[PDB]
């Protein structure tokens, strides 16, 4: 419920999950990462869309079953004097696999000769500094984009909505929800047993 207190959004569309039904399901393994986008490539943070940006820096996997949250930022980190806080990787040797945080300082080469620290030649720096000013409308504008990942690994659910639980009922064919496992049937006492670790 704290999501809606963060201005009108250019986001909240989701793939593989229902944004309207965010309280009934229960799961675990929640990971969240934060970055910024220019604004003209907001839709580039999506499975199946591959270009230059979000391909050499952070490639979203096809099997991600998650979505992002974002809104316009004209008073948070946009200054008239400029904001040089954020950078991104211009050049990479090959395509970057998903969920790999990489650091690079060495000079990217564009020829057959060796190149590690030589400037003024066809080798170029693989990074550049952002320039954020209000004179750019959509092309150069900071955004409050945060990616959220949902993992459906076989584990007991830990984090979900604060909805209260009801009393146990027996010998009735009803619908049950046990840590996000929706099922229908009649509940009976279990004569079966196993080692108490599952």
């Amino acid at each position, epitope marked *: 419920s704290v999501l809606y207190n963060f201005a009108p959004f250019f986001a909240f569309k989701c793939y593989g999950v229902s944004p309207t039904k965010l309280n009934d399901l229960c799961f675990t393994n929640v990971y969240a990462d934060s970055f910024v986008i220019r604004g003209n490539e907001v839709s580039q943070i999506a499975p199946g869309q591959t270009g230059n940006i979000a391909d050499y820096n952070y490639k979203l996997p096809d099997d991600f079953t998650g979505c992002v949250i974002a809104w316009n930022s004209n008073k948070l980190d946009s*200054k*008239v*004097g*400029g*904001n*040089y*806080n954020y*950078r991104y990787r211009l050049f990479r040797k090959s395509n970057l696999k998903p969920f790999e945080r990489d650091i690079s*300082t060495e*000079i990217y080469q564009a020829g057959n000769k060796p190149c590690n*620290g*030589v*400037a*003024g*030649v066809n080798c170029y720096f693989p*990074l*550049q*500094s952002y*320039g954020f000013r209000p004179t750019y409308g959509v092309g150069h504008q900071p955004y409050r984009v945060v990616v959220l990942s949902f993992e459906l690994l076989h584990a007991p659910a830990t984090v979900c909505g604060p909805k209260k639980s009801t009393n146990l009922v027996k010998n009735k064919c009803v619908n049950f929800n046990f840590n996000g496992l929706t099922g229908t049937g009649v509940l009976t006492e279990s004569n079966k047993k196993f080692l108490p670790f599952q």
Partner: antibody
Amino acid sequence: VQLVQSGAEVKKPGASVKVSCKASGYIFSDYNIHWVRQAPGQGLEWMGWISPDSDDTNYAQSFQGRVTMTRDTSITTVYMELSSLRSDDTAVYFCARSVGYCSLNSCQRWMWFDTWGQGALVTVSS
Amino acid sequence: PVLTQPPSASGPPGQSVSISCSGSRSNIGTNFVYWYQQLPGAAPKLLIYKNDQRPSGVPERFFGSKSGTSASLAISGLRSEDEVDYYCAAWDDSLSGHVFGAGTKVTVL
């Protein structure tokens, strides 16, 4: 516009001197500021960078504990102090300032002193 | 530390005077070097930034380019702007900050 610095005159060694850098015109919350000293007969020498909206402090690898600066966002000025002055560390001080705002070490590749502010050359003598 | 720069560089007008700036691999080649000049009793002014572009009000005879481990500056004609000392601005990781030159005293002949 240009920046100012309230320097001092010739002073005895082993004392404390306080200067004040006051902004003028623009709202002093978006420009990263620097400091520099230029010895007579020598070149400029870098000291550090601070931002007058957050608690980020950095120094060079020669004056880590020698200097200590204070920031006042509401008062809208920046002080720094020199303690236990020797005969060689005294130099002319300019309140440097670079365009843009960032607080990372890798950001300094694209950070340069686009504009310069005037200062003063306080000195030391016994 | 400070970079090795020749302080005694001069020449008659009509020819080219070259001033070089020696530095380490982390200072020159992996970082963008800058060129600045200053007057006695006056604030320094920007002449060459990023070694590719020149700002407004700067004469086009100024030139600063990088080609290896040591940058250099070349000037053509010494009439009014090359009678004052210059500086070599660069950034490295030797002190977690920027470096400056020792001053190149250039006179008029």
